[PDB]
Ligand binder design. Structure first.
Ligand SMILES: O=C(CCCC[C@@H]1SC[C@@H]2NC(=O)N[C@@H]21)NCCN(Cc1ccccn1)Cc1ccccn1
Ligand SMILES: O=C(CCCC[C@@H]1SC[C@@H]2NC(=O)N[C@@H]21)NCCN(Cc1ccccn1)Cc1ccccn1
Ligand SMILES: O=C(CCCC[C@@H]1SC[C@@H]2NC(=O)N[C@@H]21)NCCN(Cc1ccccn1)Cc1ccccn1
Ligand SMILES: O=C(CCCC[C@@H]1SC[C@@H]2NC(=O)N[C@@H]21)NCCN(Cc1ccccn1)Cc1ccccn1
Ligand SMILES: [Cu+2]
Ligand SMILES: [Cu+2]
Ligand SMILES: [Cu+2]
Ligand SMILES: [Cu+2]
Lengths: 123, 123, 123, 123
């Protein structure tokens, strides 16, 4: 599959670092370090990927989650990235993400940010 | 924390079933069964939640991922849910989600659907 | 078409008020009053809708924009709602929205909130 | 304001062409031509922008809508772009978008795609 292509260290356009291991069963496990926001050091991440993707040139669907609490900081929030891995000489993981932070019910309408990250193997 | 409140079986407005266990360390593990789409039976899910949320009445941020492959079907896609758990007599998990499916590079602009699910303990 | 069904006053789950006129050519024009956020009184809105929708029971696609500046307040932001109108005894406009606020380049990753509003003719 | 900076022709990363006029009152009017999808030729667009943005280096919030019907084609859908204009030697409009297409109630969960476009004055 793409187990070998996905496993490793990835970097996004903000300078964040995404370290992941893809399991034969579709599991994703690793750590995430964000260059921006209320974050410092590494955070636990877990997710899933399609371990038997199509063979027609389509990308490989995947997703993962980080809750922004570690031994140093708690930002009472979590981000999920949803996207596809695209292999080749210039491999990429193209994603869109949702960041939800805890709010009161009255402020819940404003609880979720949306964005997009592109991860590459270099930089 | 909310370990006890989150762990259990949840149902969304489509009739889907979300079975999860919240760990003391912030882990989420379980299965998901969707009432709609290219899905049948249960799928593995993993995620994270804030295990030390604020005590001011704010919700508890969390997220999880399902890759839509199991022993019966493969839809070459994955969904991530991002949201917050709100406890009380009428406990809820209010979420927004991103569903990415594998595509060629030319069709990648159309690869991601967005929606929102509300999960309750009843129905 | 749905010109007659769309034109009028609509209310969402937050208590906001959406007053719109649908033109024969696909134009939407009106005002929006939000019950939440950095808003007060009415704001100008403009948008578009499908003036020749399918006749198979499908909804009618539409969208509109509000920039949050009026004679009283400026929140340096704009929201776009994208969705479909569903006619009948219990007519609805089901939407998802994106709220972008002006930021510096360093904070741009956090510039956009996402949510969902359901509008009805009553309440 | 940014009336002069916004008005003109813009191009995104797909090769689409966005022609807009910014009014002194905050109005946006023009045409959109998409290089991808069920689209051909030009489509009417309308939107709004912040006509008195902050003067601290922040971007200028804006949004617009296209319903995908013209004299040649109807795709029973509409897209809204939400974002901010960033002036300078390399001016940009950075956006995220929501594309909703008409569906039956049973398929409504799958009615909305999400993406992101960056518009520049060249290419
Ligand atoms: O900033 C974070 C955690 C780090 C997010 C980095 C994102 S993930 C997507 C993108 N990709 C990256 O690599 N990095 C960024 N959470 C915001 C939580 N706060 C809301 C918020 C929203 C916007 C700006 C600041 N805060 C609430 C709060 C609770 C307590 C204290 C302080 N704040
Ligand atoms: O339908 C699925 C998996 C189930 C999703 C259920 C969602 S998750 C969010 C929401 N909440 C729920 O409880 N249920 C729904 N994936 C679509 C993958 N296909 C694209 C697609 C998009 C829209 C409609 C149908 N297909 C691509 C494809 C690859 C091979 C074969 C067939 N199709
Ligand atoms: O609140 C607004 C305008 C009203 C939005 C109501 C939304 S639209 C979608 C939903 N549906 C509704 O009917 N109502 C809500 N804009 C936020 C702009 N600010 C960021 C921001 C983000 C979150 C919370 C507060 N502020 C930036 C800023 C610039 C200057 C001063 C103050 N603030
Ligand atoms: O493709 C369109 C209109 C053009 C969209 C271009 C987007 S806008 C955002 C991005 N930025 C750009 O510059 N271009 C792209 N609408 C899809 C409507 N159809 C669903 C759909 C979804 C995915 C792929 C194809 N179709 C439904 C349908 C109704 C009748 C017939 C055929 N199809
Ligand atoms: Cu914060
Ligand atoms: Cu499918
Ligand atoms: Cu504000
Ligand atoms: Cu189509």
């Amino acid at each position: 599959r793409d187990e070998a292509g996905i496993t490793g260290t990835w970097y996004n356009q903000l300078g964040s670092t995404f370290i992941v291991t893809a399991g034969a069963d579709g599991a994703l496990t690793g750590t995430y370090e964000s260059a921006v926001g209320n974050a410092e050091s590494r955070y636990v991440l877990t997710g899933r990927y399609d371990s038997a993707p199509a063979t027609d040139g389509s990308g490989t669907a995947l997703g993962w989650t980080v809750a922004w609490k570690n031994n140093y900081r708690n930002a009472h929030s979590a981000t999920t990235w949803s996207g596809q891995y695209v292999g080749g000489a210039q491999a990429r993981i193209n994603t869109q993400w949702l960041l939800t932070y805890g709010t009161t019910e009255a402020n819940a309408w404003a609880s979720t940010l949306v964005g997009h990250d592109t991860f590459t193997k270099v930089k």
